[PDB]
Amino acid sequence: PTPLLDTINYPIHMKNLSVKELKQLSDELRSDVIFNVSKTLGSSLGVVELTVALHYIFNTPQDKILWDVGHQSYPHKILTGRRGKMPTMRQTNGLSGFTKRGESEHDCFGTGHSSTTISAGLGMAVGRDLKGKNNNVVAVIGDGAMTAGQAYEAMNNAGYLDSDMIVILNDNKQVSLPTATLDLFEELGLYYIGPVDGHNIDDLVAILKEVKSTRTTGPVLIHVVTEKGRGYPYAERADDKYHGVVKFDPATGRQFKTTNKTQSYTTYFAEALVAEAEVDKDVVAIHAAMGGGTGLNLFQRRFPTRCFDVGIAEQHAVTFAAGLACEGLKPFCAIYSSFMQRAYDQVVHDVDLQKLPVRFAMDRAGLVGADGPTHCGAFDVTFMACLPNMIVMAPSDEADLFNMVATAVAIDDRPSCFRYPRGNGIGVALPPGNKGVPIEIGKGRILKEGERVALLGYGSAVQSCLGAAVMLEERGLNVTVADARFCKPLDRALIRSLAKSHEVLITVEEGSIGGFGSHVVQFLALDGLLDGKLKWRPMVLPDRYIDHGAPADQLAEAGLMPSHIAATALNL
Amino acid sequence: PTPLLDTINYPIHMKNLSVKELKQLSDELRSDVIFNVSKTLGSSLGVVELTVALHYIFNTPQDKILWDVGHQSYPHKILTGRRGKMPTMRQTNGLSGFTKRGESEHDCFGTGHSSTTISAGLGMAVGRDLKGKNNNVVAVIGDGAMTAGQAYEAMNNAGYLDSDMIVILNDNKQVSLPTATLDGPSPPVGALSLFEELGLYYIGPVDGHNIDDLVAILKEVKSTRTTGPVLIHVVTEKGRGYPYAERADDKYHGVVKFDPATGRQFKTTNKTQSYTTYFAEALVAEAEVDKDVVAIHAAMGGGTGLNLFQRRFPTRCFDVGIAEQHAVTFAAGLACEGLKPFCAIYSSFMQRAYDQVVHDVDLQKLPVRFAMDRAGLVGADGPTHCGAFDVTFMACLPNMIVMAPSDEADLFNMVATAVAIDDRPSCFRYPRGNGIGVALPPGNKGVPIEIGKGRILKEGERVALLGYGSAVQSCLGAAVMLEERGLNVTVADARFCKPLDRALIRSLAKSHEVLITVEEGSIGGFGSHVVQFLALDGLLDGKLKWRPMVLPDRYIDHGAPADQLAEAGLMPSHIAATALNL
């Protein structure tokens, strides 16, 4: 089916094609990408031709092709000797769902988060020039990634430093976020070439040949125009869906309706928020690029006058919420915890200094699994929690999430963060939450009795704690499990009470071991409860970035999953 | 001549003094500056006319005049009732040297970081529109603020949403906006200031000092009759109407004490050997012998000290403009290509690049060094500029080594290790302030240090004061007496916050009745790490009596670092009070 690609293990092999074969090769690549994604598309498909043209033209890994986000670089990987590893792309122990510098020499940059390619490529371009080297730099940034500030300033500087580099604007007219499986410029003083057919491969080859070496005059933006999902009609027709398509039949487009087959924390936040804004005209939702993936599609439909896609500009989303909140709105930045890091300062400075009524509904909090280390949102519990007046929450379920939403909208005290994972609300065997009644902010909830050992933890981590303590449920609840559904402030009182009465605690968070665990320990230290009588066992994400997997795999290896909490509890 | 503007008390009063009265107001402002100097600049002067025009045209605080960074808004504050509080601006318990929403109704936003005004004013514009309100929104943003991504994306979105709102692109010379904690920012290439693709109304460039024209422009754009977002490129000499400031907007950015009559200033403050100078000196020294070394700064070249570095190693110096995100990911790209890029940047501004550190650098463990100036309390630039968070936010980032040199020697050693340690990133956090100038490499300030390994600086086994940088100086100063008291209370240069000296922590932890940690950071940083390490070293009963003596989890208003530190209870006196509490 793919005779060209069968003889392509690398960009050299592609160059052994003729330009004419590249159209054939791209169809093959798209059919490979289709198949790769068929298991459970649009960005990579939309990028095939330019990937092909770039690897036909450019001499990676000598030349540097940087893929903003790297989600569209499936053909790039395929064409860089990772074709047969596409099957395990993003899978645990497999390749990344992005270009990953550690994965491939052809991966110039370790992307996931967007808009970095320009800056990275600028870095490379300068860094080459500094070393007196002379290889190309190419970035491929999506139009979505171009909306980001770091893209734009990077271009400002790229076009200020005037180095060899070829930005490609891959305009399929899609804001496409960072994720690893499931997702002119006049004043920049940059050459601008396009828009062009981002699927006329031979033309992209021709352009790329003729632009990459203009470089003595400085950088070029090659605006190409793609079709997201290109060469998969269904993906072309429904790029938003198909971009992160589930298991689909390449024959029919028909896919597994995971979204509907579940109910996500996105959905819950979305439902809670679309519910909230009905009764609250100050409520305004803001997503950076993620009306879909923070679930706000219905919100955007229902409250279009209160919905703000900033594109992939989390900083924007947050400081725009700061501005909304400054005008006495109740702006809610829907965003992932991984992307909240982009807005970090905007939280700190733009919001929290003035203790603004910015709520943050924080998806993908902790380990996102598949989206790997670029997208593991394990750090918000740390970084948000060091910000004065950033209240931080983690709902155990949609009820708590709503309550949390409902408090933050109602509490103009200061901003509130609500962190909840990529996934769906599991609350069957494990105790979930209330029903939709605003709780006391900062006040945890014991969900299991016990005074020997207390498993302070929240959201995904409380599911783990409760899961760990399941047997303790059945055994007179020796091990308490507290919904430490407030990371900021902590339930200092509950902490104090458990920590003064328990031989030990376990803290658990789907976060790095600088977050909640460190807060609990901080608070205990402040309470002087960190005597040798007291112990505390932080069972969390380690201080190592977490390569793509299942969250369960990663959490298991991190040792916060029920088994590992239980192993801690056996160590206790 | 105070009188005229002295009898002026409200925006209405200012409006009452219009044509052939603006000049008198300017003279009064100059006189006020002189009076402020006698007992006890550059953008504020450069922005007088725009501020005047904006307050003349716009009915703040009903209308919203936002000031990107907020530093240039001295006339704004002056003209919004804080004229007699300019004397106490940036002073402890006084007003912010930036617009601060909690300071004034007229401060529509709380700035000090750059590039926020657009996003903020967009938020205000939307928020108005959503509330069915109809007040003007205007932001004044410098071009230097404009170079930032957050500016640019916000404008991208501003022009996407097409709400009524106004951006006054300030700074024709394109000179970096005057950051209260940064210094000679003039070699910055921040000149984004054009917006066709932003779909924003664009007007100007206009004389940003022709006030009556600014008023005229402002009337005809920032009426409620104007739909959608407008950029008013004004053209504003930084230092305008102060010749010396106009001549040296780099210096008069943030001029020291000076005589209005003569421009003569106390270069003295800057004549101190700063941590900027040490980093700069170390780095300019390092890059001589290291061609992988590339310094990067986000428009802070003066106050990261890199003016000499840019001079000596222009081929390795990268002002990215006010684009810390850019600096860090660009350093990630340099670092990817096997450089040893060093993002010189302030800890407050490093927060901008936070993700870029996390994602762009640390996930690939890139050789991005960070020379984090303004670490901890910067003092008088207050909560918008206190870099007390790096010790927290960086320290949760896998493989982000974090240091704090106790002096230039340690800073060099630190620099010299991170350059050598090109398998990972390293942050070096040192305050706004001064230390000791060491000899160049001829005197071998390239002392080798073991990264991650603290240094006991004072003996003691009763109490151990783990601290670094400003906080070690506090610990050692706390332990001044302890020293004269048979050295009961050790002080450890906890000069590594990541990794900690787990071994030393452990060894002090298990031997001392008590610890103190001390950091010129929030009580989420070093202290939280120590206690996290003690937690994990419950193997060795890290369950000592620990005292985190640090910046509270409260944003700190502009003051002296020492005032703020004292109030934060990390200063020597407070550590000693802690030591008595131990």
Provide a descriptive summary of the structure in words.
The structure is a homodimer. By secondary structure, chain A is of the alpha/beta class. Chain A has 3 domains: 1-257, no CATH class; 258-441, no CATH class; 442-572, no CATH class. Helices cover 39% and strands 15% of the residues of chain A. In chain A, the strands form 3 sheets. Chain A has a 7-stranded mixed beta sheet, with helices on both faces. In chain A, strands 1-2-3-5-4 form a 5-stranded parallel beta sheet, sandwiched between helices. In chain A, α14 (297-302) links the parallel β6 and β7 (307-309). The longest helix of chain A is centred in the first third of the chain and has 19 residues, at 20-38. Chain A starts with a helix and ends with a helix. Chains A and B meet through α6, α8, α15, α17 and α23 of A and α7, α9, α15, α17 and α23 of B. Chain B: This is 1-deoxy-D-xylulose-5-phosphate synthase, chloroplastic. Chain B: Homodimer. Chain B: It catalyses: D-glyceraldehyde 3-phosphate + pyruvate + H(+) = 1-deoxy-D-xylulose 5-phosphate + CO2.
Provide keyphrases for this structure.
homodimer; five-stranded parallel β-sheet; 3 domains; 17 strands; seven-stranded mixed β-sheet
Tell me the strand percentage band of chain A. 15-25%
Q: For the largest beta sheet of chain A, what order do the strands appear in spatially? A: 7-6-8-9-11-10-15
N-to-C span of chain A: 58 Å
Largest interface: A-B, 113 and 116 residues
**Principal-axis shape of chain A:** globular
Number of helices of chain A: 25
Main sheet specs of chain A: 7 strands, mixed
Radius of gyration of chain A (Å): 24 Å
Number of strands of chain A: 17
The number of domains of chain A: 3
Helical proportion of chain A? 25-40%
The structure class of chain A reads alpha/beta
Name the assembly state: homodimer
PDB class: transferase
Keywords: 1-deoxy-D-xylulose 5-phosphate synthase, plant protein, transferase
Assembly: dimeric
Entry title: dxps
